[PDB]
Amino acid sequence: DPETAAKFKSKNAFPDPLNDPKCNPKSLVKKYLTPKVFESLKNKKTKLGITLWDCINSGVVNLDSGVGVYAGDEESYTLFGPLFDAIIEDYHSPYKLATGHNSDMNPAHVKAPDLDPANRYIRSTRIRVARSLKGYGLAPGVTKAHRLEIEKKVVGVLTSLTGDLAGKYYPLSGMDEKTRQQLVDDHFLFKKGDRFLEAAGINKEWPEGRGIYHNNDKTFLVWLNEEDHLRIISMEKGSDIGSVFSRLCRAVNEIDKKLGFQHTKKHGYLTSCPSNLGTGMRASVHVKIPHAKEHPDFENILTKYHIQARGIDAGVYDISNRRRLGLSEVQCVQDMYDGVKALMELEKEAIAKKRSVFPEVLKNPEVKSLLRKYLTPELFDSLKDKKTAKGISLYDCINSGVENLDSSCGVYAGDEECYTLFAPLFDKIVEDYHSPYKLANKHTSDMNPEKVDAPNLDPEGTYIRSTRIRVARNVKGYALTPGLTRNERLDIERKVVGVLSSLTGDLAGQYYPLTGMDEATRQKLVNDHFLFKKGDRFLEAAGVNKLWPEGRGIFHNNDKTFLVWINEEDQLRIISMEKGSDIGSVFGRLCRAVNEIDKQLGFQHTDAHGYLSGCPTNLGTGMRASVHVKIPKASAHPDFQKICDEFHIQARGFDISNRRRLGLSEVQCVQDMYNGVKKLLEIEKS
Ligand SMILES: Nc1ncnc2c1ncn2[C@@H]1O[C@H](COP(=O)(O)OP(=O)(O)O)[C@@H](O)[C@H]1O
């Protein structure tokens, strides 16, 4: 009811609408703005001309207000003290203004070893602070010129930031619809203030003087002249709150050194809304704690570390500090860290207990996964307490098969060591799926295209319609896809993109990261059938979809013959494809690119398993050679089945592909693909 409140404001009369027609019982302005308080202060004005009615207006206009007051300037907090002091000490109880507040923005005082590098629990981390500049009023009392001055001074500081803090400023006045659309996508844009901010006078001269700064990494974000002069945000996926706090402090302290902030001993940093006083800080973490949420100690942990939990997928909560006043920013972050760590240990207890016994669901005879076939309780009990150097357990490896009972295999490797440490399971699975290959036989890799003699089969394209060869590779030195930490995944993306951008000739192309993928870029790539989406339930349970879509992307050449998927199911899925028949050309292109990547980075590889992958089906050559070919006549001939078995290739309604991956080189596999097709099309002249 803006129109009603204006009538009282125009008379400078007591705001009757506070006398609950439908006013919030908890409303602090209703509680502390009494007739005598109003009478005592209604004629007082700050140097900036802020009145009591200016400060209380939002709370009278918006009767559902929890707080209902905004300060126009620093003087408002003293001049209208009797009102603000009561509101502050009630909202921030048991804080006492007489006690005082101590700020601390030294990140070195924070002790925060990274809680969750593997991202088993924590999804994202974010720290926000609100700050106001010296020499000016607060948001409701800022003049038109002052706001422009603030924009000018802040941008000057922000545009001179270096390192990971370097970035771009986007003012709201103007902003191409293109730019706007992009910022909405990143969730970096703020809109006109809601009814609470409107009634506080915060939307004055919208959108003049308002703007957005972000660094190139998009891990640092500043809102200029929104609810306060500055809303400064440091954030990233994963759990590294110490890193997040450090980046925040570097930027905030630099701005403070050049401009200075509004700050008192009793209020801490000054903000428009009294709720944001003190640290002006909200430190936050998104974390999956379904089991901890139901533990009886849950609420007592929140109370103990002074944190709160809010609903956001399933079991994922927003954990943030409850306190602003009476504690330092350092103490606030530390309490956040300790509370989250405590809740994480709870979650780890429940999961460890549940993983301590043999998965009873595997005892069902309707389950026909390889996991069920080979994993006995005795084998489980022999392996269950063991972990690789990266902390990968047996249960980590079989999790997808236990969560998805309809798995064909159900077992993934988090790292190379899994194939050794959990050999009594992996050996059986490998030798079963890749039967009759024996691990003792060892495997020979060979990516020399000159050792293939494959003259073109069907240059008319009479039968063969297209030729596709894919290889799966993983980068040496890292875990496999299910076991990747956040930093590993990003590091792999950076290195591979660095290599792919050095590719010349017809290998030249560019990289399309899934993160920051607009609309025009997406739907296009999809038409080419180049786009890959998020993994399914099997990959999710394996740990392949962690931090999606961070670090994922697509590279293709101009001719669209050479394609690379980065950090999908394997770290590198490399595809060469074209035309109709020339198997020898596809492979030559494939080898040129793969060998160059191999030379710069290296691949995970053993004698026994060939090229390593998270999924045992992709071992050895890690290669799929496929032929699309019209063969009506030979498919019914009594030699067709003799042929497929003799050359160990499979035919599927008419996809012609290799069945073998282990115990043969890539040269040998391609040559056999050729020869098999050669005798198949041979009958297409019966
Ligand atoms: N740890 C986090 N990771 C990612 N996003 C977050 C995190 N914490 C909060 N957010 C998002 O930031 C947005 C604004 O946060 P909000 O709860 O309004 O805090 P603030 O008062 O600092 O703006 C919300 O949409 C919320 O989903």
UniProtKB/Swiss-Prot annotation:
Residues 121-350, 463-686 form the Phosphagen kinase C-terminal domain. Approximate repeats lie at residues 1-354, 355-686. One of its GO terms (cellular component) is extracellular space. Keywords: ATP-binding, Kinase, Nucleotide-binding, Repeat, Transferase. Residues 9-93, 353-435 form the Phosphagen kinase N-terminal domain. It comes from Anthopleura japonica (Sea anemone). This is Arginine kinase. InterPro entries: ATP-guanido_PTrfase (IPR000749), ATP-guanido_PTrfase_AS (IPR022415), ATP-guanido_PTrfase_cat (IPR022414), ATP-guanido_PTrfase_N (IPR022413), ATP-guanido_PTrfase_N_sf (IPR036802), Gln_synth/guanido_kin_cat_dom (IPR014746). Pfam families: ATP-gua_Ptrans, ATP-gua_PtransN. GO terms for biological process: phosphocreatine biosynthetic process. It catalyses: L-arginine + ATP = N(omega)-phospho-L-arginine + ADP + H(+). ATP binds at S124, T125, R126, I127, R128, H187, R231, R282, A283, S284, V285, H286. It comes from the Eukaryota. Belongs to the ATP:guanido phosphotransferase family.
